[PDB]
Design an enzyme around this catalytic site. Structure first.
Site, PDB file in Angstrom:
ATOM      1  N   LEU A  53      -3.185   5.495 -29.199  1.00 50.56           N
ATOM      2  CA  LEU A  53      -4.697   5.764 -28.849  1.00 50.56           C
ATOM      3  C   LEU A  53      -5.603   6.111 -30.010  1.00 50.56           C
ATOM      4  O   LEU A  53      -6.624   5.626 -30.643  1.00 50.56           O
ATOM      5  CB  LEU A  53      -5.091   6.303 -27.491  1.00 50.56           C
ATOM      6  CG  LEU A  53      -4.265   6.067 -26.464  1.00 50.56           C
ATOM      7  CD1 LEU A  53      -4.605   6.855 -25.237  1.00 50.56           C
ATOM      8  CD2 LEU A  53      -4.397   4.431 -25.993  1.00 50.56           C
ATOM      9  N   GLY A  54      -5.449   7.615 -30.427  1.00 48.21           N
ATOM     10  CA  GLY A  54      -5.876   8.279 -31.443  1.00 48.21           C
ATOM     11  C   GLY A  54      -5.409   9.440 -31.983  1.00 48.21           C
ATOM     12  O   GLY A  54      -4.357   9.831 -31.581  1.00 48.21           O
ATOM     13  N   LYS A  61      -0.743  13.636 -24.744  1.00 52.17           N
ATOM     14  CA  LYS A  61      -1.029  14.285 -25.892  1.00 52.17           C
ATOM     15  C   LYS A  61       0.158  15.166 -26.606  1.00 52.17           C
ATOM     16  O   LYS A  61       0.844  15.612 -25.939  1.00 52.17           O
ATOM     17  CB  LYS A  61      -2.387  15.441 -25.567  1.00 52.17           C
ATOM     18  CG  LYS A  61      -2.799  15.942 -26.897  1.00 52.17           C
ATOM     19  CD  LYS A  61      -4.121  16.455 -26.592  1.00 52.17           C
ATOM     20  CE  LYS A  61      -5.003  17.083 -27.890  1.00 52.17           C
ATOM     21  NZ  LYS A  61      -6.118  17.915 -27.787  1.00 52.17           N
ATOM     22  N   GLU A  88      -5.358  12.065 -17.874  1.00 56.03           N
ATOM     23  CA  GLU A  88      -6.056  10.833 -17.117  1.00 56.03           C
ATOM     24  C   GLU A  88      -6.076   9.956 -18.349  1.00 56.03           C
ATOM     25  O   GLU A  88      -7.214  10.210 -19.308  1.00 56.03           O
ATOM     26  CB  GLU A  88      -7.096  11.226 -16.488  1.00 56.03           C
ATOM     27  CG  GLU A  88      -8.170  10.178 -16.007  1.00 56.03           C
ATOM     28  CD  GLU A  88      -9.296  10.875 -15.509  1.00 56.03           C
ATOM     29  OE1 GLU A  88      -9.951  11.925 -15.405  1.00 56.03           O
ATOM     30  OE2 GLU A  88      -9.609  10.090 -14.542  1.00 56.03           O
ATOM     31  N   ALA A  96      -2.488  16.884 -33.077  1.00 51.34           N
ATOM     32  CA  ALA A  96      -1.900  16.128 -31.925  1.00 51.34           C
ATOM     33  C   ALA A  96      -2.366  14.604 -32.351  1.00 51.34           C
ATOM     34  O   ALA A  96      -2.858  14.067 -33.117  1.00 51.34           O
ATOM     35  CB  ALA A  96      -2.634  16.239 -30.648  1.00 51.34           C
ATOM     36  N   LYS A  97      -1.251  13.833 -31.767  1.00 49.27           N
ATOM     37  CA  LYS A  97      -1.296  12.234 -31.580  1.00 49.27           C
ATOM     38  C   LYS A  97      -1.414  12.239 -29.955  1.00 49.27           C
ATOM     39  O   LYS A  97      -0.713  12.449 -29.198  1.00 49.27           O
ATOM     40  CB  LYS A  97      -0.154  11.685 -32.274  1.00 49.27           C
ATOM     41  CG  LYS A  97      -0.247  11.563 -33.731  1.00 49.27           C
ATOM     42  CD  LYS A  97       0.987  11.080 -34.169  1.00 49.27           C
ATOM     43  CE  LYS A  97       0.956  11.193 -35.930  1.00 49.27           C
ATOM     44  NZ  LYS A  97       2.086  10.587 -36.842  1.00 49.27           N
ATOM     45  N   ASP A 140     -16.948  21.930 -28.688  1.00 52.70           N
ATOM     46  CA  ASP A 140     -16.856  20.854 -29.460  1.00 52.70           C
ATOM     47  C   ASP A 140     -17.398  19.613 -28.547  1.00 52.70           C
ATOM     48  O   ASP A 140     -16.654  18.493 -28.897  1.00 52.70           O
ATOM     49  CB  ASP A 140     -15.634  20.863 -30.051  1.00 52.70           C
ATOM     50  CG  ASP A 140     -15.513  19.873 -31.327  1.00 52.70           C
ATOM     51  OD1 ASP A 140     -16.838  19.648 -31.698  1.00 52.70           O
ATOM     52  OD2 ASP A 140     -14.659  19.242 -31.782  1.00 52.70           O
TER      53      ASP A 140
END
Ligand SMILES: COc1ccc(N2CCN(C)CC2)cc1Nc1ncc2c(n1)-c1c(c(C(N)=O)nn1C)CC2
Ligand SMILES: COc1ccc(N2CCN(C)CC2)cc1Nc1ncc2c(n1)-c1c(c(C(N)=O)nn1C)CC2
Ligand SMILES: [Zn+2]
Ligand SMILES: [Zn+2]
Lengths: 290, 290
Positions: free
Chosen positions: A21-22, A44, A93, A27-28, A138
């Site tokens: 995803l990103g 995550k 989720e 993290a990935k 953030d």
């Protein structure tokens, strides 16, 4: 090295690692599906090699502590966490329609009724955070995620902090937020209002099609933030422009509180669609009567 | 992708790429030797893929502009630069004995006469920078390099800035220095004194064996810096302790100027070796009379 199949001992659960995803900070994130019920989630994944210093560990642990205790329609649901010897895994989720950032890169300035739609749900989630004494710190386009119905889910609690007693001013923020409030830059002490300021900038971006304090140097940007140095283009409706300004003020006492916001004329005297179509990801919606 | 053999058109020169030295920000450094005269150098190599935004480019260009015009016994000599389509190459004086940082990791607290030795040359180089209207802004152990004779060479001008007119206060610093002055953190406007403050911290580290404002969180560290929150252990000689304090003051007007420093009792009433042996890289020197 990230294993193809994430195993939780204790819950017995296995998850097949899937589509990337990103990425961000330590993290990935991947699409993961439970090998049994087949139900799909976002995972995550933080490598322990990046969490060698206790201070980094405590951040990760704080993220989970805060996120763990939160359930609300407009905040990315927490479905568990676990670790092996090399990684930490957080099961969240899945939001199939990515985030506001990708919407913003495609559509630029949104139509006014869209901004109301999204802003409302953003405010709603944040109303929940604030009444539970949580500060996100953030809020930005890339942290506001969209599920298949285009419903907003506040995500990424990696800079979040729990308020512990009345009138507490948090004095450090260890990270670099996107839409960072002036009172964080000047180290004047900060609390919930940082989030209203951010929603200020998100409103600006959604309506104007670019961030209120962009330059080519972060430090010049910072200088602008501190000196309230922004301006709203002339085509923005005065009622909208007026909400933006109320929120984008240097003095945090003077900004609306998250609960004052939905009562604003911007929402109460404008049209707020009950729902948005998928087309609106790529086509400006006209909201025709038939 | 970095080519094995660095070619300057215009000067005709070729350099064989050699031993890896260290890395930082956008750059990597190697031992390089001229294919012809065989003379040996350090090559600072910046990939153009990391310099896509003009702002990053202008930083690289500013580093070269400032470094280019500087020649002094105690500043890493500049011997040229050139580029191809993928990299920028900067050819510098090789310092075979690494930097103060590696000395510090091996020896911890230095003997007082050593600190005088090194501090003097640090001050000397910086005296040269200041009279030429240059502010380093990141003096730290890893930027102070040692040649084969253990002579100090100030290096890394990637945060350096040229003062342009009398009383100019630089208002931004785009980078994160190690021993950052209080008036940079508070954004009060800054000039030459930032370097004296840094030499303050370097003196502290060389004599004490650890940095004056270390914690596990940079932001907590920052909080300490702003509130002058440090303390000198009791075994440090009062004359040394006194120079450290003079330099480590919150108010930049009150710190000595780089030219006041060698006149300090710390230098004038203590022993300063004319030279140090290689052993002193690993063994505390006693300075015996025979
Ligand atoms: C198909 O599903 C997705 C595709 C793209 C994106 N991204 C949105 C933000 N962006 C900058 C990169 C793409 C997101 C989803 N869905 C998606 N769903 C749930 C989550 C994530 N992404 C996710 C999380 C975080 C985080 N910081 O905690 N980062 N991502 C990526 C929160 C959990
Ligand atoms: C054998 O020669 C060396 C071995 C180790 C080191 N390092 C000193 C700093 N450190 C943190 C890594 C090792 C340095 C040298 N010699 C060496 N000589 C000259 C230079 C460099 N290193 C160098 C430069 C920079 C920069 N930031 O501009 N970084 N390095 C590494 C300045 C030019
Ligand atoms: Zn910058
Ligand atoms: Zn920290």
């Amino acid at each position: 090295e990230i294993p193809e199949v994430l195993v939780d001992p204790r819950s017995r659960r296995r998850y097949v690692r899937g589509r990337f995803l990103g990425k961000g900070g330590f993290a990935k994130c991947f699409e993961i599906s439970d090998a049994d019920t087949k139900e799909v989630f976002a995972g995550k994944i933080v490598p322990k090699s990046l969490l060698l210093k206790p201070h980094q560990r405590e951040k990760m642990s704080m993220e989970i502590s805060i996120h763990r205790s939160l359930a609300h329609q407009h905040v990315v649901g927490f479905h568990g966490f676990f670790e092996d010897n090399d990684f930490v895994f957080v099961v969240l989720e899945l939001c199939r329609r990515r985030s506001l950032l990708e919407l913003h890169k495609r559509r630029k300035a949104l139509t006014e009724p869209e901004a109301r739609y999204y802003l409302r749900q953003i405010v709603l989630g944040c109303q929940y955070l604030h009444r539970n004494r949580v500060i996100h710190r953030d809020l930005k386009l890339g942290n506001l995620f969209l599920n298949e119905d285009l419903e907003v889910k506040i995500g990424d609690f990696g800079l979040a902090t729990k308020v512990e007693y009345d009138g507490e001013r948090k004095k450090t923020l260890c990270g670099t937020p996107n839409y960072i409030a002036p009172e964080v830059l000047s180290k004047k002490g900060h609390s919930f209002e940082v989030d209203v300021w951010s929603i200020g900038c998100i409103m600006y971006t959604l309506l104007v099609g670019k961030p209120p304090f962009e330059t080519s140097c972060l430090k010049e940007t910072y200088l602008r933030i501190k000196k309230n140095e922004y301006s709203i283009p002339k085509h923005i409706n005065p009622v909208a422009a007026s909400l933006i300004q109320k929120m984008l003020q240097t003095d945090p006492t003077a900004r609306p509180t998250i609960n004052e916001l939905l009562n604003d004329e911007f929402f109460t005297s404008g049209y707020i669609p009950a729902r948005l179509p998928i087309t609106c990801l790529t086509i400006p919606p006209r909201f025709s009567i038939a």
